Symmetry: D2
Amino acid sequence: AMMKAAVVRAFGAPLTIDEVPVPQPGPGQVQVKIEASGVCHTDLHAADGDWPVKPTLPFIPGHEGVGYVSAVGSGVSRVKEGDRVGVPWLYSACGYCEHCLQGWETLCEKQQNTGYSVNGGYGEYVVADPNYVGLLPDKVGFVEIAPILCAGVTVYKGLKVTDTRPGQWVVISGIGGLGHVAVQYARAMGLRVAAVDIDDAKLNLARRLGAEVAVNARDTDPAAWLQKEIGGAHGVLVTAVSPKAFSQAIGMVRRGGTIALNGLPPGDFGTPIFDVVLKGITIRGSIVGTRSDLQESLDFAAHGDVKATVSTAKLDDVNDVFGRLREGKVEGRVVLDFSR
Amino acid sequence: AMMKAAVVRAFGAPLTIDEVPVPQPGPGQVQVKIEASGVCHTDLHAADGDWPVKPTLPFIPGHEGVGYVSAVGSGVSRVKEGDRVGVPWLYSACGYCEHCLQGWETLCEKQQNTGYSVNGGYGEYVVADPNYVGLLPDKVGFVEIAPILCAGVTVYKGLKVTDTRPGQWVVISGIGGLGHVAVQYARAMGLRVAAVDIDDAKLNLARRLGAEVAVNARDTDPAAWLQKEIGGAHGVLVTAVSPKAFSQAIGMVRRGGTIALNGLPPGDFGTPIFDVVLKGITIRGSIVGTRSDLQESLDFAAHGDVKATVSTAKLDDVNDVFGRLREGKVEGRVVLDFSR
Amino acid sequence: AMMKAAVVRAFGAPLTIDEVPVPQPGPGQVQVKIEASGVCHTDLHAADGDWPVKPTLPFIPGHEGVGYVSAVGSGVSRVKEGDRVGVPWLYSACGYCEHCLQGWETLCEKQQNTGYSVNGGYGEYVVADPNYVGLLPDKVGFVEIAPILCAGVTVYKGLKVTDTRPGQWVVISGIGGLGHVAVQYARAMGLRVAAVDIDDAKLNLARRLGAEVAVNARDTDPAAWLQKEIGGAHGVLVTAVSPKAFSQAIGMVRRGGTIALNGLPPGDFGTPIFDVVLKGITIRGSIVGTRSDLQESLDFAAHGDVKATVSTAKLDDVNDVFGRLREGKVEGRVVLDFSR
Amino acid sequence: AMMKAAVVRAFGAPLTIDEVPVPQPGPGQVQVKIEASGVCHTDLHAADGDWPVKPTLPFIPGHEGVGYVSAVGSGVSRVKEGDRVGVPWLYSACGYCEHCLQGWETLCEKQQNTGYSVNGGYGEYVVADPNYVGLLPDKVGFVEIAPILCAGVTVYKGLKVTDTRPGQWVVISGIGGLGHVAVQYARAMGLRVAAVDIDDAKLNLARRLGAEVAVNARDTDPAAWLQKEIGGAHGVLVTAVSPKAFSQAIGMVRRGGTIALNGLPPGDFGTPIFDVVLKGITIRGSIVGTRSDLQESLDFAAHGDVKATVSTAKLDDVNDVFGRLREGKVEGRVVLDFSR
Ligand SMILES: NC(=O)c1ccc[n+]([C@@H]2O[C@H](COP(=O)([O-])OP(=O)(O)OC[C@H]3O[C@H](n4cnc5c(N)ncnc54)[C@@H](O)[C@H]3O)[C@H](O)[C@@H]2O)c1
Ligand SMILES: NC(=O)c1ccc[n+]([C@@H]2O[C@H](COP(=O)([O-])OP(=O)(O)OC[C@H]3O[C@H](n4cnc5c(N)ncnc54)[C@@H](O)[C@H]3O)[C@H](O)[C@@H]2O)c1
Ligand SMILES: [Zn+2]
Ligand SMILES: [Zn+2]
Ligand SMILES: [Zn+2]
Ligand SMILES: [Zn+2]
Ligand SMILES: [Zn+2]
Ligand SMILES: [Zn+2]
Ligand SMILES: [Zn+2]
Ligand SMILES: [Zn+2]
């Protein structure tokens, strides 16, 4: 069989929509027929090769792909034909290293990554390791659930590692794909939410989704504004694609506070070490989520606590989507629709 | 009515040994007769007034003073005349704020600091808040115990917040004033210790103190070496916080590990986003510790698990001591001896 | 000079409403004019003289008393006259023992207890230690806020130590004074709530307050019912006044689950050690709440996440109230109203 | 084709040493050649059908088998022929449930148990799940390391879940098979150890093992004595879970402390509600541990920190070994030696 897929063949170049072979599932593998496929900013980073560790060319991006198990190899019991599943960033892990045994498989040094080191969901079919796919809730459709496969799980875990508790203030910096669902997860976790971005439309989105307070960093110093407004936050989750937002976030927290980092813009960010030490601040990188994180994050969507803001696009228009996302002209998430 | 003391009357100017009034305790206060008083780099910064918030002039430095309770004001029960106590960095906290109520008095924004914002232990007597003094162990001398009020509790708390466990690997970065004490706490906390420095003398000291591994970063890349040799460290205590140490720490820590920063350097440090996020690294600021932190750290000294390298000097020679410290000629810690 | 107050002058006997002197505050003390005063089930035992350690006669019960500071002793800074305050079970703690230094003053062995070891709020005025009173929010009435002083802060802390997190199930056993507000805190902390009691009306109250499911332990074996309905809970908070309910709670959790204990019926409860060990179960006593806990719990009420179901009664009818409480004829809390 | 093995063919009856087929490994399985095989009280309960859920007959007991990997089915990468491994209590788990995904495979409700629900190590060979075998340290012999698969990991994990930290007091209740090993882990974990038993010889053993204090409960009340002498222990490990040990544990622990139960006794225990709640005490069931726990516990043995008292016996004499066990004649641990 042949299939349509969007392929990266050179960093910086537009993706090409080509006919490629349908991947077949070997032993212990499953095949997934894609019905929807979220566009993550990471996909831009990957196609631009602006990260230290590059994807091997060529490749098909996409780690927010969801659909049906359309075929099953041998020795597979976790899922069966017809099951609704998603294939996330964490494609697979070794399962027995120290990290994996501790239930921190997101840290597995032997992990594979969907739509980066292996081909992803920007296509009609994708092969997956059934041991690491998301098991989708029956009551949420493909288009709405797709973003939870990365945006959702990531910020859910990110919020967990801020070490904030119900009643406390958390700041979400960057109300994009990750950010806009981050606001919703925070409320579901009993947190009071403040939002920071550089575009009023984003802040308006945050306001609708539960943000009690919101500030535009292009209009004022957000750190100073937040210190005055709420006395500083107990936690911050940075999803912004700007190193500047990382530095600013550090000045947003109360003493003893924690800043968790999701965003992956190239380079360093300026860190006021003196204040971090004097104020006992924690800065903490968070990387997607374990299978347990993933399952829990899907359950919040299933219960209606989190609903992704989504607009659809066609596979063929993937380069336009990339352009819009790059220009910050996307509200929430774009999901590629493969439905009939 | 009068006592000798080393007084800062102008930032940068030599301290003068003056006759000044013995401070007398009012209600809820105590008086301490100093037998020994530790010196460290923080005293230089107080005397130079080169930190963001300066001491008020004139003032008596010293946050490592130890001695006997020589008099009490009314309504004191925690201690009595004749008790052996130290008057550490945390002179007092408000006791009512969110931080104080949570047992994190070190983060109190209304805290006072001994030998910085109030008069300290560079004198024959000092008035203190008995609610915040350290209660000293019987079986350890004043001179030997003094540095535990600072270096001790600092590296102890710092090691605690790396969130490591017995059997796990911790790197002690820098085996100087703080580091040589740190190696001892780590060993007593059941940690496997790797010492990193640029000086073979200090690395050999580390080995004497129980370091299982020692690597000289002048010759070899401590990060590459440790990742290979022990798979990276679960924790990293950075006692000399320089850009190189900071960045090498990020390289030495294994994924999911924690880096605790034990120093107050000037300027912003470039923090690499990609590495912190994808390695799920925690970077945590930590200096001194709470009252309970301090008592716990003293217990280690009392049981002979921790002993600071100490040399004595006279109060009258403090300027000479400051000079030696500035030039980096001080091995271990210098302690002013008030005993006849 | 004189005030009205319900006094316990001999155990097991009716309380006598008498005129007694008004207590005056000395140094470090404040006087409080009572506006409302919650009746805790604990008060029944203070008066029966029921417990291992008994109050001393004669005494005035009541540790849910709220009102205004009407007089301030010497050396008090935390509060001033006119301040809205409440006087909880934890009347005072020593402030410097190991527990107190760790922000666990509820464990202080030198603590005093309001309406037990010292006189409480079943009277027009009560003297308190200003360092341990609750600072009440302006936007909640005295009658509604009164239960938060014990019922509220207790179950809030109890829920904290179930070690449950958003999305997970918690069971509230006993939907009384503590229980009916526990359901609400649970919801505010992002938990899904199941309710257990022995009276359909109390279960219906839980449901109206946010309980998703409910079971009458008189009608079926709760535990088996809960294992079937929700697959066991992640945590349980037991406020019930029956040892039986403690034994049943143990069987209500998933493996790895935690049961927190608040209720204080006399004697032992049957514990299946074999299952507790095989299933890795945790059983944990929880004792009111620290000042931090209390302020946090008052905040939930201030924001309207929590609202006590209360009936009022006159001080003079306190014996009638006791009777009804003892018979389980009370809906939520009864609060003594001193409103002129 | 054939091998010797001890088989339970009827509950209560002597084991019969038979010649049975050597088990061959299918895909995902490995075969282990046994060199040593630990014996403990759990084997008695397996042989007696003593417990609620019984083994199926006939079966080969033994959950402490160690040896070489002698054959490797298809799709195995964790281990290879010649690898020195152990086949502990947790033969396998489902790997997909809530518990397995969270790194708590010990709580898997679909787990299989070696030498209980599947054939174990009381034979020359045994087939195992490579994903769940213990990877044995190079420097420790088969006989010495065998008990660590059981007693070792149990007491290590048990100590971990006391939530104590270095410098803090831990009580080891019972210095027998589990206890003498627990004392060693405790010291290596930096804990101050108080040993409690009723046998002076076992108490002397504890002291020589590093116990700082030892109380004989025949002659003195250990609760009152320890409360007076060390202000209660922060943690208590109950290795011999009898009602008396349980109740005394509750009296020995300091307020806020944690009691970890390491045994599987019959029947309900009377738990004092008042003491547990008022003292804020945690009671916690813990036996064996995860794969991560086992590997950590194995490292302590590899470093010389922990050594089980071991004596050997032959497979043919297992019934006699059982005899001694039953009568309580066994000091330390007995290990079957299969070596030439
Ligand atoms: N660490 C992980 O596990 C993980 C997983 C997924 C994505 N990511 C990262 O997420 C980031 C982007 O995620 P995305 O899908 O939401 O992309 P993006 O299109 O969705 O979201 C952009 C957001 O950051 C923007 N932003 C730019 N400058 C800002 C500033 N100064 N302050 C506040 N906000 C600012 C905002 O416009 C906001 O839209 C990084 O690009 C990277 O892809 C990390
Ligand atoms: N540990 C603490 O810090 C703390 C603080 C306050 C009160 N308490 C305790 O709270 C308990 C009750 O408090 P209260 O103020 O809510 O009084 P209570 O009258 O209000 O509450 C009774 C509740 O438990 C009852 N109940 C009886 N048998 C039951 C069973 N088998 N299963 C489930 N529920 C059952 C229910 O009727 C329900 O009303 C104890 O009486 C004790 O006083 C503890
Ligand atoms: Zn992504
Ligand atoms: Zn792995
Ligand atoms: Zn110092
Ligand atoms: Zn304060
Ligand atoms: Zn009460
Ligand atoms: Zn106290
Ligand atoms: Zn065993
Ligand atoms: Zn499982």
